[PDB]
Amino acid sequence: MQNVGFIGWRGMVGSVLMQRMVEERDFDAIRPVFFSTSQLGQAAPSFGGTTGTLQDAFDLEALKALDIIVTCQGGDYTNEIYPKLRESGWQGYWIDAASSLRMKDDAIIILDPVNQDVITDGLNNGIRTFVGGNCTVSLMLMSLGGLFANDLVDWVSVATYQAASGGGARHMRELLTQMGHLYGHVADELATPSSAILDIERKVTTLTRSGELPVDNFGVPLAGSLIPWIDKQLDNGQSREEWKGQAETNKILNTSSVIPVDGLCVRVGALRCHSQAFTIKLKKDVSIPTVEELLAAHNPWAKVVPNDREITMRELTPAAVTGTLTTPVGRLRKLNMGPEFLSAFTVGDQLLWGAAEPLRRMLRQLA
Amino acid sequence: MQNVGFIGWRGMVGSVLMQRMVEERDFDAIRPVFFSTSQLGQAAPSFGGTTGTLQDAFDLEALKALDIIVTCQGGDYTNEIYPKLRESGWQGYWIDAASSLRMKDDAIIILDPVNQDVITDGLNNGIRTFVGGNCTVSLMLMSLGGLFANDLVDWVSVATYQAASGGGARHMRELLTQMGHLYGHVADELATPSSAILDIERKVTTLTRSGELPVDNFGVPLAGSLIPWIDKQLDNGQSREEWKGQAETNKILNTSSVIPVDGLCVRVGALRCHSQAFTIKLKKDVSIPTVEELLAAHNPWAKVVPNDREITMRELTPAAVTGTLTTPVGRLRKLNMGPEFLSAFTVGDQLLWGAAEPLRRMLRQLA
Ligand code: NA
Ligand code: NA
Ligand code: NA
Ligand code: NA
Ligand code: NA
């Protein structure tokens, strides 16, 4: 079996990865070694199946002995250790959740249900570095995989509804804490049937602007609001989050010609699920029934939700998707602009297909 | 002095209207009469230094004695009374917030900062029925009016982030109460520094799908989620909310040729503000500086927010816009599809320009 090291397994993304690996019994097929910085020397996690000890995440010798390394530690860790490992002559496999190495020429962005062909070709051509793609793009491709696989996409315009988990654990806690502040401030009024709605709203609105809401992580309030800007501002007017759409979509698919992908990435008051609205320009006029068939046939997670009111309300929402591996796509119909214009709405959990799942599956392929 | 009757003045939209009328001293030039659908006989609001009794909203003789009727009562009321009132020989002015008469041949959809010419022509041509437009369309036009007025729009695709107020007062209370349930369920964990984020989220997620949350008004949860379907299902696959986009935009502007308007209307966890993401196809390559100038020059409420990170976070959000008459537009840049593809993000209060304000302004013109 292969000797596999795990870095950042206690972080949020790493914890989801561990959860999934235990669910799939992935530790029975490998010889796992766990790393740490604040708990080195302590016993390895029992769920790992070994009686080992937590190794030093910065001990190069401990790392060099491994065949595979799966890290969810972050960019800073990768930027320090990855180069040192490669410079030492280490030719093992590096599976990373951080975005740092995504655009490197010797790295492949992984999402096997979509680009297994790219992964296989890379493995045969000496690629030893595999990086998960941005949550937004990975979820988009999991849901719309059938359209891209059949080369039916001319261009894609998107408007996202992104969850707090994308920001981080403390961001999620900030969102929930804010919900508590808003409700608590008008709890008495809500409990009073005769209270005036405009009195309730005024109080919530005023509190939101009061400066009393904790906003250290998002900068501004999120509960009851939204923020139409995610990540650093670029010279072309895009946010880095929006820039990743075209950059990563094309690298994941290894397109022969650039497929334009652009839009607005907005942070909303959701915990883990990213929802996305699309305006897709098709290369040709294909019927909706054919579109539904192609999307559903691509992979088992792209559940097609019939374009009917009640079922959409029940299945195409964060409430129905959080914590699941399903990446449903619905509201499929042609837009008024023409038969080559397709509308679509998707939902997907940011921590699974958008983070940990592609890593677990890549590791399984190498086991 | 015109005799003006008010219906549905006690409800949420009516209350916002009353508040605005008080702020602008709109009761001074008219003789106000207040009606009730179930409380006739009780004292009437002592607005504009007047006193009286609530009249019967269903008494045709009482209604016929008026010169102008301003109703925020709703479609069911309009559908029952309007035809009977007109058939009884009433030739007064009917100003309505309900969608009922919007597409009638003898009615004009009003948004004066955008279509005063249409309103003026209608008045001279005998039109006596004026109806406010859908909140989505009215807010879109208040923000993007400059692009339409200069006939630069080929087509527009939209993704909305609609507030609960569009559903109603009960809907808003349901959202806030749900926020209370979600936070309350994990309040102890949030207050514990060492608590694990995944344990917190697991509980919130489970509670959300438990069936314990109150959802009588929206059907499914809204706090921490969203619903990509608003109003009745139509045969073309659109929801009625989405259908109003093209129908009302073209009628408000009185276009010579149909401008395609389509997209997805999504309900989100906001109280009063609607936000909208746009993909606009221009008829020609217009520079962003020119676009900014045209938008700002159209009307005083179309605040152009510079496409910069920090200012966008502070001003292009529901938190910054709720309760104000400002209808800001930002994130203006060209999309990767080409120089004729324009991106824009708008925010606007649903109860003001999206409901009550157009009515107040129309009344002022008839006083
Ligand atoms: Na071996
Ligand atoms: Na840092
Ligand atoms: Na259908
Ligand atoms: Na007269
Ligand atoms: Na700029």
XYZ file of C-alpha atoms and ligand atoms in Angstrom:
739
model
C 0.000 0.000 0.000
C 0.962 3.658 -0.296
C 2.255 5.778 2.573
C 0.052 8.868 2.733
C 0.525 11.974 4.838
C -2.261 14.322 5.890
C -1.708 18.005 6.654
C -4.406 20.336 7.983
C -6.755 17.442 8.691
C -8.204 19.250 11.724
C -9.118 22.417 9.844
C -12.594 22.882 8.417
C -11.941 21.510 4.924
C -9.625 18.854 6.338
C -12.320 17.762 8.787
C -14.838 17.289 5.994
C -12.192 15.281 4.138
C -11.614 13.065 7.205
C -15.376 12.620 7.624
C -15.758 11.484 4.014
C -12.715 9.209 4.136
C -14.129 7.447 7.196
C -17.540 7.153 5.520
C -15.906 5.541 2.475
C -13.416 3.469 4.503
C -10.531 5.089 2.619
C -8.046 4.482 5.438
C -8.206 0.704 5.025
C -6.607 1.044 1.585
C -3.552 3.053 2.692
C -0.880 3.529 5.368
C -1.795 6.974 6.798
C 0.529 9.343 8.650
C -0.921 12.423 10.352
C 0.890 15.730 10.801
C 0.536 18.630 13.217
C 2.287 21.671 14.683
C 0.495 22.309 17.967
C -0.052 18.639 18.836
C 3.072 16.917 17.528
C 4.115 13.963 19.654
C 0.540 13.100 20.589
C -1.241 9.966 19.360
C -2.473 9.692 15.780
C -6.288 9.791 15.324
C -7.867 6.423 16.087
C -10.096 6.725 13.016
C -6.923 6.447 10.959
C -6.475 2.810 11.898
C -2.899 3.174 13.128
C -1.184 3.409 16.499
C 1.174 6.049 15.159
C 2.090 9.498 16.431
C 1.427 12.971 15.034
C 4.446 14.023 12.994
C 5.961 17.490 12.572
C 4.343 19.183 9.554
C 7.675 20.936 8.938
C 9.880 17.858 9.342
C 11.091 17.367 5.758
C 12.421 13.890 6.479
C 9.026 12.740 7.735
C 7.448 14.161 4.573
C 10.034 12.723 2.159
C 9.286 9.187 3.378
C 5.736 9.485 1.986
C 4.442 8.450 -1.442
C 1.506 10.843 -1.310
C 0.691 14.008 0.622
C -2.844 15.366 0.933
C -2.897 18.868 2.384
C -5.796 21.085 3.432
C -3.484 23.345 5.459
C -3.523 26.348 3.137
C -1.468 28.485 0.782
C 1.134 29.638 3.303
C 2.020 26.027 4.123
C 2.174 24.996 0.470
C 4.301 28.004 -0.470
C 6.865 27.049 2.162
C 6.939 23.243 2.062
C 6.071 22.309 -1.534
C 9.169 23.986 -3.036
C 11.455 22.529 -0.364
C 10.072 19.050 -1.023
C 10.438 19.277 -4.795
C 13.904 20.820 -4.443
C 14.919 17.835 -2.303
C 14.108 15.579 -5.245
C 10.821 14.267 -3.826
C 8.723 12.855 -6.667
C 5.680 11.864 -4.643
C 2.127 12.991 -5.343
C 0.974 16.310 -3.888
C -2.822 16.671 -3.586
C -3.728 20.191 -2.463
C -6.873 22.101 -1.472
C -5.073 25.473 -1.616
C -5.282 27.643 -4.750
C -1.560 28.465 -4.750
C -0.423 25.835 -7.279
C -3.527 25.742 -9.506
C -2.116 27.678 -12.448
C 1.359 26.107 -12.410
C 2.371 24.407 -15.666
C 3.319 21.200 -13.854
C 0.054 21.014 -11.926
C -3.399 19.795 -12.894
C -6.664 21.097 -11.448
C -8.688 18.030 -10.444
C -12.414 17.251 -10.758
C -12.352 13.657 -12.018
C -16.047 13.227 -12.851
C -15.420 16.028 -15.347
C -11.765 15.839 -16.411
C -10.580 12.291 -15.710
C -9.128 12.260 -19.233
C -6.942 15.237 -18.357
C -5.903 13.613 -15.084
C -5.032 10.283 -16.723
C -3.000 11.962 -19.465
C -1.160 13.980 -16.838
C -0.346 10.920 -14.739
C 1.129 9.241 -17.818
C 3.138 12.374 -18.615
C 4.825 12.820 -15.238
C 2.448 15.261 -13.531
C 2.722 14.685 -9.771
C 0.851 17.737 -8.478
C -2.944 17.805 -8.320
C -4.922 20.760 -7.008
C -8.624 21.144 -6.294
C -10.374 23.869 -8.267
C -12.183 26.947 -6.955
C -15.508 26.079 -5.317
C -17.553 28.186 -7.749
C -16.047 26.600 -10.865
C -16.030 23.035 -9.534
C -19.697 23.219 -8.557
C -20.569 24.774 -11.919
C -18.840 21.976 -13.834
C -20.326 19.216 -11.677
C -23.838 20.487 -12.414
C -23.289 21.558 -16.036
C -20.779 18.841 -16.924
C -22.950 17.377 -19.667
C -23.043 20.642 -21.609
C -19.271 21.075 -21.573
C -18.504 17.401 -22.220
C -20.568 17.586 -25.417
C -18.922 20.873 -26.425
C -22.220 22.770 -26.482
C -21.039 25.860 -24.598
C -20.097 29.011 -26.511
C -19.910 31.266 -23.432
C -21.295 31.515 -19.899
C -22.430 34.511 -17.840
C -22.966 33.880 -14.132
C -24.351 35.517 -10.993
C -23.427 33.668 -7.805
C -24.989 33.365 -4.352
C -21.981 32.260 -2.295
C -21.942 30.825 1.220
C -19.905 31.972 4.213
C -17.921 28.722 4.388
C -15.974 30.012 1.400
C -14.656 32.748 3.647
C -13.896 30.381 6.495
C -14.998 28.964 9.836
C -14.976 32.289 11.684
C -16.968 33.855 8.833
C -19.701 31.258 9.304
C -19.818 31.965 13.040
C -20.024 35.690 12.314
C -23.037 35.162 10.045
C -24.897 33.071 12.617
C -24.027 35.462 15.444
C -25.420 38.340 13.375
C -28.691 36.443 12.861
C -28.861 36.215 16.638
C -28.351 39.964 17.043
C -31.048 40.870 14.523
C -33.674 38.469 15.872
C -32.872 39.194 19.509
C -33.287 42.924 18.972
C -36.898 42.463 17.834
C -37.766 39.248 19.677
C -40.378 41.000 21.838
C -42.102 42.556 18.815
C -42.148 39.280 16.902
C -43.753 37.685 19.967
C -46.429 40.410 19.895
C -49.095 39.635 17.255
C -50.251 43.265 17.008
C -46.781 44.771 16.512
C -46.234 46.895 13.390
C -44.005 45.371 10.714
C -42.472 48.746 9.861
C -41.460 49.209 13.506
C -39.806 45.779 13.448
C -38.005 46.434 10.169
C -36.838 49.903 11.210
C -35.214 48.453 14.330
C -33.446 45.698 12.384
C -32.326 48.153 9.708
C -31.018 50.640 12.272
C -29.183 47.943 14.233
C -27.534 46.734 11.032
C -26.032 50.200 10.469
C -25.387 50.934 14.148
C -21.922 49.404 14.243
C -23.040 46.996 16.960
C -22.979 43.998 14.620
C -19.700 42.035 14.698
C -18.240 42.389 11.185
C -14.514 41.762 11.694
C -14.343 38.994 9.094
C -16.601 40.207 6.260
C -15.999 43.912 6.854
C -19.700 44.719 6.553
C -22.916 42.950 7.649
C -23.968 39.721 5.934
C -27.116 38.601 7.771
C -30.030 40.209 5.942
C -27.660 41.580 3.312
C -25.140 40.561 0.646
C -21.736 41.675 -0.607
C -21.186 41.952 -4.397
C -17.388 41.676 -4.171
C -15.298 38.645 -3.245
C -11.493 38.688 -2.982
C -8.926 41.155 -4.350
C -9.664 43.795 -6.969
C -7.891 43.304 -10.306
C -6.947 45.964 -12.866
C -9.560 44.754 -15.375
C -12.416 45.441 -12.966
C -13.000 41.832 -11.938
C -12.587 40.520 -8.416
C -10.131 37.617 -8.252
C -13.085 35.310 -7.539
C -14.689 36.297 -10.842
C -11.349 36.015 -12.667
C -11.033 32.370 -11.619
C -14.150 31.480 -13.593
C -12.571 31.632 -17.036
C -9.045 30.773 -15.912
C -9.937 27.578 -14.074
C -12.810 26.403 -16.267
C -10.518 26.324 -19.285
C -7.613 24.677 -17.440
C -9.809 22.000 -15.870
C -11.317 21.121 -19.253
C -8.056 21.700 -21.138
C -9.992 23.499 -23.887
C -8.581 23.869 -27.411
C -9.938 27.426 -27.591
C -10.947 29.751 -24.751
C -14.532 29.470 -23.530
C -15.534 32.894 -22.164
C -16.772 32.664 -18.567
C -17.545 35.782 -16.552
C -20.028 37.354 -14.186
C -20.603 38.620 -10.669
C -19.622 36.739 -7.511
C -21.789 37.765 -4.555
C -21.543 36.672 -0.915
C -24.919 35.855 0.656
C -26.239 34.718 4.037
C -25.834 30.977 3.485
C -23.629 28.661 5.553
C -22.176 26.087 3.126
C -24.033 26.102 -0.200
C -23.180 28.101 -3.302
C -26.082 28.712 -5.678
C -25.516 30.044 -9.199
C -27.706 31.549 -11.922
C -26.548 31.150 -15.524
C -27.120 32.572 -18.980
C -25.525 29.999 -21.271
C -24.972 30.613 -24.978
C -25.115 27.250 -26.745
C -23.136 26.481 -29.903
C -26.339 25.145 -31.461
C -30.056 24.798 -30.814
C -30.649 21.662 -28.741
C -34.033 20.916 -27.177
C -34.571 21.223 -23.437
C -35.369 17.496 -23.164
C -32.014 16.774 -24.812
C -30.284 19.234 -22.470
C -31.868 17.560 -19.437
C -30.768 14.159 -20.712
C -27.157 15.208 -21.339
C -26.845 16.879 -17.936
C -28.303 13.944 -16.002
C -26.238 11.370 -17.904
C -22.867 13.042 -17.289
C -22.554 12.123 -13.605
C -24.856 10.883 -10.799
C -24.563 14.069 -8.722
C -25.948 16.471 -11.333
C -29.553 15.739 -10.419
C -31.868 17.470 -12.873
C -34.735 19.166 -11.065
C -37.867 19.353 -13.250
C -38.710 22.954 -14.135
C -41.870 22.944 -12.028
C -42.653 25.207 -9.072
C -43.058 22.969 -6.024
C -40.293 20.476 -6.780
C -37.934 23.392 -7.478
C -38.828 24.925 -4.116
C -38.035 21.619 -2.393
C -34.897 20.433 -4.197
C -33.087 23.417 -5.726
C -32.040 25.243 -2.562
C -29.252 25.379 0.024
C -31.686 23.948 2.598
C -32.023 20.789 0.513
C -28.384 20.534 -0.544
C -26.172 21.429 2.450
C -24.078 18.491 3.629
C -24.959 16.328 0.623
C -22.965 15.372 -2.475
C -25.798 16.410 -4.783
C -25.139 19.294 -7.203
C -28.648 19.790 -8.675
C -29.399 21.898 -11.733
C -32.843 23.254 -12.551
C -34.939 26.049 -14.070
C -33.819 24.785 -17.466
C -35.481 26.634 -20.349
C -34.572 28.753 -23.343
C -34.369 32.487 -22.671
C -36.342 35.071 -24.650
C -33.160 36.116 -26.476
C -33.347 32.976 -28.602
C -33.186 29.143 -28.797
C -29.401 29.253 -28.364
C -29.751 30.965 -24.972
C -30.161 28.581 -22.032
C -31.107 29.479 -18.465
C -29.997 27.334 -15.531
C -29.814 27.535 -11.737
C -27.540 25.302 -9.673
C -26.831 24.568 -6.012
C -23.910 22.751 -4.419
C -22.170 22.295 -1.076
C -18.945 24.345 -0.993
C -17.017 21.992 1.304
C -17.681 18.744 -0.562
C -17.392 18.955 -4.356
C -16.221 22.516 -3.863
C -13.325 21.506 -1.619
C -12.700 18.103 -0.007
C -14.329 15.568 -2.326
C -12.058 15.978 -5.369
C -9.070 15.371 -3.087
C -10.494 12.165 -1.599
C -11.255 10.772 -5.049
C -7.837 11.641 -6.487
C -6.162 9.917 -3.537
C -8.327 6.849 -4.116
C -7.120 6.710 -7.731
C -3.509 6.636 -6.534
C -4.074 4.165 -3.691
C -59.438 70.454 -4.104
C -59.782 66.850 -5.266
C -61.616 64.258 -3.189
C -59.170 61.377 -2.834
C -60.016 57.970 -1.422
C -57.425 55.649 0.092
C -57.825 51.865 0.186
C -55.396 49.519 1.946
C -53.690 52.446 3.687
C -53.261 50.403 6.884
C -51.292 47.576 5.259
C -47.522 47.535 4.781
C -47.363 49.144 1.334
C -50.091 51.588 2.322
C -48.220 52.477 5.512
C -45.065 53.285 3.561
C -47.228 55.413 1.269
C -48.805 57.241 4.215
C -45.383 57.840 5.752
C -44.033 59.296 2.509
C -47.131 61.444 2.071
C -46.660 62.845 5.590
C -42.979 63.567 4.904
C -43.877 65.396 1.692
C -47.024 67.037 3.113
C -49.148 65.487 0.358
C -52.416 65.581 2.334
C -52.565 69.392 2.445
C -53.738 69.892 -1.151
C -56.389 67.172 -1.158
C -59.510 66.133 0.717
C -58.633 62.596 1.934
C -61.236 59.909 2.582
C -60.162 56.645 4.183
C -61.802 53.305 3.453
C -61.819 49.931 5.184
C -62.707 46.423 4.010
C -63.643 45.163 7.477
C -63.524 48.081 9.930
C -65.975 50.616 8.510
C -67.389 52.985 11.108
C -64.205 53.282 13.160
C -62.237 56.538 13.351
C -60.113 57.448 10.329
C -56.415 58.441 10.357
C -56.172 62.121 11.251
C -53.735 62.917 8.429
C -53.345 66.428 7.048
C -55.211 67.949 9.973
C -58.440 66.152 9.086
C -60.752 63.896 11.086
C -63.498 61.483 10.123
C -64.735 57.916 9.901
C -63.641 54.931 7.815
C -65.860 54.435 4.766
C -66.978 51.146 3.192
C -64.400 50.014 0.619
C -67.144 47.997 -1.101
C -69.767 50.763 -1.218
C -69.882 51.844 -4.868
C -71.793 55.042 -4.064
C -69.123 56.146 -1.600
C -66.403 55.345 -4.146
C -68.253 57.051 -7.011
C -68.255 60.333 -5.085
C -64.445 60.489 -5.282
C -62.284 62.183 -7.915
C -59.282 59.936 -7.333
C -58.784 56.535 -5.704
C -55.378 55.349 -4.501
C -55.380 51.674 -3.596
C -52.727 49.477 -1.995
C -55.381 46.915 -1.050
C -54.376 44.271 -3.593
C -55.406 42.326 -6.678
C -58.447 40.570 -5.220
C -59.900 43.939 -4.248
C -59.126 45.542 -7.612
C -60.497 42.566 -9.551
C -63.811 42.829 -7.712
C -64.301 46.586 -7.402
C -62.635 48.208 -10.418
C -64.903 46.667 -13.098
C -68.025 47.438 -11.066
C -66.912 51.007 -10.402
C -66.180 51.728 -14.078
C -69.427 50.045 -15.124
C -71.322 52.283 -12.692
C -70.128 55.307 -14.667
C -67.206 56.458 -12.513
C -64.780 58.559 -14.555
C -62.282 59.313 -11.807
C -58.597 58.409 -11.640
C -57.593 54.981 -10.324
C -54.016 54.717 -8.978
C -53.150 51.119 -8.094
C -50.237 49.205 -6.559
C -51.667 45.814 -7.578
C -50.527 44.040 -10.753
C -54.115 43.316 -11.849
C -54.571 46.121 -14.405
C -50.977 46.582 -15.580
C -51.463 44.948 -18.969
C -54.920 46.381 -19.697
C -55.264 48.472 -22.868
C -56.746 51.422 -20.973
C -54.096 51.447 -18.252
C -50.593 52.879 -18.069
C -47.800 51.459 -15.914
C -46.261 54.406 -14.060
C -42.632 55.212 -13.180
C -42.481 58.936 -13.963
C -38.717 59.455 -13.675
C -38.537 56.957 -16.527
C -41.736 57.375 -18.553
C -43.247 60.796 -17.838
C -43.777 61.257 -21.589
C -45.939 58.136 -21.675
C -47.908 59.345 -18.652
C -48.419 62.848 -20.044
C -49.611 61.485 -23.388
C -51.988 59.107 -21.652
C -53.543 61.878 -19.575
C -54.158 63.955 -22.701
C -55.575 60.912 -24.481
C -58.163 60.097 -21.828
C -56.302 57.461 -19.809
C -57.659 57.388 -16.243
C -56.029 54.257 -14.838
C -52.431 54.295 -13.653
C -50.675 51.310 -12.118
C -47.293 50.949 -10.464
C -44.944 48.454 -12.081
C -43.456 45.298 -10.598
C -40.818 45.998 -7.958
C -38.135 44.182 -9.964
C -38.751 46.076 -13.210
C -39.229 49.467 -11.548
C -35.961 49.144 -9.615
C -34.145 47.909 -12.723
C -35.320 50.926 -14.729
C -34.601 53.461 -11.979
C -30.995 52.219 -11.900
C -30.425 51.488 -15.592
C -32.777 54.060 -17.108
C -29.910 55.840 -18.830
C -29.084 52.816 -20.972
C -32.675 52.365 -22.133
C -33.310 56.077 -22.704
C -30.324 56.227 -25.056
C -31.553 53.069 -26.815
C -28.334 51.181 -26.113
C -29.915 47.940 -24.911
C -30.155 44.956 -27.265
C -31.232 42.520 -24.534
C -30.822 41.959 -20.814
C -30.399 38.827 -18.716
C -31.037 39.113 -14.982
C -30.510 37.157 -11.770
C -32.363 38.689 -8.822
C -31.865 38.583 -5.051
C -35.358 39.535 -3.863
C -36.369 40.572 -0.352
C -39.119 39.071 1.786
C -41.179 42.282 1.770
C -42.172 41.349 -1.777
C -43.949 38.402 -0.219
C -45.446 40.416 2.611
C -45.333 41.454 6.256
C -45.988 37.901 7.449
C -43.176 36.693 5.194
C -40.748 39.177 6.730
C -41.698 38.046 10.237
C -41.230 34.417 9.183
C -37.687 35.134 7.964
C -36.709 36.913 11.185
C -38.291 34.251 13.372
C -36.360 31.581 11.469
C -33.114 33.471 12.083
C -34.019 33.267 15.753
C -34.522 29.508 15.582
C -31.211 28.904 13.797
C -29.151 31.023 16.182
C -30.982 29.877 19.301
C -30.274 26.246 18.441
C -26.510 26.845 18.549
C -26.237 29.894 20.819
C -24.305 27.962 23.475
C -21.793 26.653 20.926
C -21.275 30.078 19.360
C -20.524 31.463 22.830
C -17.921 28.721 23.325
C -14.585 29.781 21.746
C -13.329 26.202 21.355
C -16.506 24.831 19.745
C -16.105 23.101 16.378
C -17.645 24.876 13.387
C -18.793 21.614 11.806
C -20.708 20.698 14.952
C -22.424 24.084 14.836
C -23.262 23.840 11.148
C -24.447 20.236 11.445
C -27.061 21.298 13.991
C -28.239 24.293 11.941
C -28.472 22.179 8.786
C -30.362 19.379 10.522
C -32.801 21.799 12.162
C -33.438 23.474 8.811
C -34.555 20.207 7.185
C -36.347 18.885 10.288
C -39.694 20.490 9.527
C -39.567 22.390 12.808
C -39.016 25.787 11.185
C -42.179 27.856 10.559
C -42.740 27.975 6.781
C -46.454 28.665 6.332
C -45.754 31.719 4.162
C -42.852 30.704 1.911
C -43.517 26.957 1.915
C -39.859 26.158 2.579
C -37.165 27.806 4.750
C -35.659 31.159 3.795
C -33.172 31.963 6.573
C -29.845 30.573 5.408
C -31.411 29.545 2.109
C -33.048 30.896 -1.041
C -35.930 29.984 -3.348
C -35.413 30.118 -7.137
C -39.122 30.395 -7.945
C -41.454 33.316 -7.308
C -45.178 33.256 -8.179
C -47.171 31.011 -10.536
C -45.720 28.646 -13.121
C -46.311 29.515 -16.787
C -46.299 27.263 -19.864
C -43.091 28.769 -21.225
C -41.190 27.635 -18.145
C -41.038 31.073 -16.532
C -42.469 32.032 -13.157
C -44.914 34.937 -13.392
C -42.312 37.112 -11.667
C -39.822 36.433 -14.473
C -42.453 36.960 -17.185
C -43.189 40.477 -15.900
C -39.647 41.481 -16.806
C -40.115 41.682 -20.562
C -43.840 42.444 -20.478
C -43.630 45.399 -18.114
C -40.276 46.794 -19.265
C -41.538 47.160 -22.816
C -44.898 48.623 -21.757
C -43.360 51.130 -19.341
C -40.904 52.319 -21.999
C -43.455 52.031 -24.814
C -40.827 50.441 -27.067
C -41.239 50.382 -30.851
C -39.598 46.955 -30.957
C -39.475 44.304 -28.240
C -36.387 44.391 -26.019
C -35.784 40.879 -24.664
C -35.668 40.789 -20.856
C -35.392 37.445 -19.110
C -33.653 35.553 -16.343
C -34.150 34.059 -12.900
C -36.049 35.571 -9.972
C -34.804 34.273 -6.630
C -36.142 34.982 -3.128
C -33.361 35.581 -0.580
C -33.039 36.344 3.129
C -33.303 40.139 2.941
C -36.066 42.257 4.498
C -36.847 45.074 2.027
C -34.088 45.416 -0.580
C -33.982 43.757 -3.990
C -30.549 43.346 -5.549
C -30.081 42.402 -9.199
C -27.176 41.097 -11.285
C -27.239 41.922 -14.991
C -25.643 40.800 -18.236
C -26.495 43.573 -20.689
C -25.930 43.290 -24.432
C -25.286 46.768 -25.834
C -26.049 47.785 -29.410
C -22.520 49.213 -29.697
C -19.194 49.427 -27.850
C -19.670 52.232 -25.324
C -16.834 53.029 -22.911
C -17.403 52.408 -19.210
C -16.835 56.095 -18.421
C -19.590 56.968 -20.903
C -21.898 54.301 -19.451
C -21.352 55.713 -15.962
C -22.153 59.232 -17.153
C -25.312 58.147 -19.000
C -26.646 56.220 -16.006
C -26.019 59.028 -13.521
C -27.492 61.619 -15.887
C -30.806 59.814 -16.330
C -32.277 60.534 -12.882
C -31.072 61.689 -9.424
C -31.579 58.308 -7.724
C -29.387 56.257 -10.075
C -26.261 56.570 -7.930
C -23.246 55.111 -9.730
C -20.981 53.315 -7.260
C -17.355 53.220 -8.496
C -16.181 49.726 -9.392
C -13.811 49.538 -6.422
C -13.804 46.917 -3.663
C -14.177 48.900 -0.426
C -16.743 51.434 -1.659
C -18.768 48.619 -3.248
C -18.842 46.713 0.048
C -20.088 49.777 1.912
C -22.635 51.189 -0.534
C -23.870 48.579 -3.028
C -25.752 46.443 -0.509
C -29.178 46.032 1.110
C -27.671 47.148 4.435
C -26.788 50.492 2.849
C -29.944 50.976 0.776
C -32.895 49.791 2.904
C -35.336 52.593 3.655
C -33.754 55.062 1.218
C -34.867 56.263 -2.226
C -31.421 55.615 -3.703
C -31.278 52.988 -6.466
C -27.487 52.505 -6.868
C -25.805 50.638 -9.694
C -22.232 49.370 -9.611
C -19.693 46.734 -10.668
C -19.889 48.313 -14.132
C -17.354 46.749 -16.504
C -17.205 44.837 -19.784
C -17.481 41.037 -19.653
C -15.054 38.564 -21.229
C -17.626 37.820 -23.946
C -16.781 41.122 -25.620
C -16.918 44.960 -25.448
C -20.665 44.943 -26.173
C -21.350 42.870 -23.041
C -21.886 44.956 -19.911
C -22.022 43.823 -16.291
C -24.033 45.703 -13.647
C -25.269 45.098 -10.100
C -28.124 47.123 -8.631
C -29.797 47.488 -5.237
C -33.098 49.175 -4.409
C -35.741 49.314 -1.685
C -38.770 47.205 -2.675
C -41.343 49.278 -0.769
C -40.379 52.717 -2.081
C -39.613 52.924 -5.812
C -40.718 49.301 -5.982
C -44.192 50.005 -4.619
C -45.346 53.179 -2.881
C -43.287 56.009 -4.375
C -44.652 55.865 -7.936
C -48.182 56.155 -6.513
C -47.417 59.205 -4.366
C -45.797 60.964 -7.308
C -48.704 60.201 -9.641
C -51.165 61.522 -7.060
C -49.156 64.750 -6.840
C -49.579 65.199 -10.595
C -53.361 64.844 -10.354
C -53.924 66.989 -7.251
Na 5.314 0.330 -1.398
Na -1.603 35.008 5.531
Na -41.977 21.609 -18.083
Na -63.270 69.284 -11.232
Na -11.794 51.604 -12.012
